Amino acid sequence: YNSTFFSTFKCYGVCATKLNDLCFSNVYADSFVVKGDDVRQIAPGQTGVI
């Protein structure tokens, strides 16, 4: 909370508020770098070059 601030944070299939008191079975993290106008393409049902 006092180090990193996110311009985008959105969750699908769950709610963010419940994330504190819920336990997850298998978790994977995928990481990369895009430009700003492409950050809206990382979502289900989108089209574009990314």
Ligand X SMILES: CCCCC/C=C/C/C=C\CCCCCCCC(=O)O
Residues near ligand X (CB under 6 A) are 6, 9, 19, 27, 29, 47-49
Residue 20 to residue 18: CA distance in whole angstroms: 5
> Would you say how long the chain is, in residues?
50
Under a CB-based contact definition with an 8 Å cutoff, are residues 40 and 47 in contact?
no
Which residues lie near a second copy (CB under 8 A)?
A: 1-2, 5-7, 9, 15-17, 19-20, 37-38, 40, 45-49
Query: Which CB atom, from 30 or from 33, has the smaller least distance to ligand X?
Result: 30
From the list a second copy, ligand X, none, partner contacted by residue 22 (C-beta under 5 to 8 A by kind): none
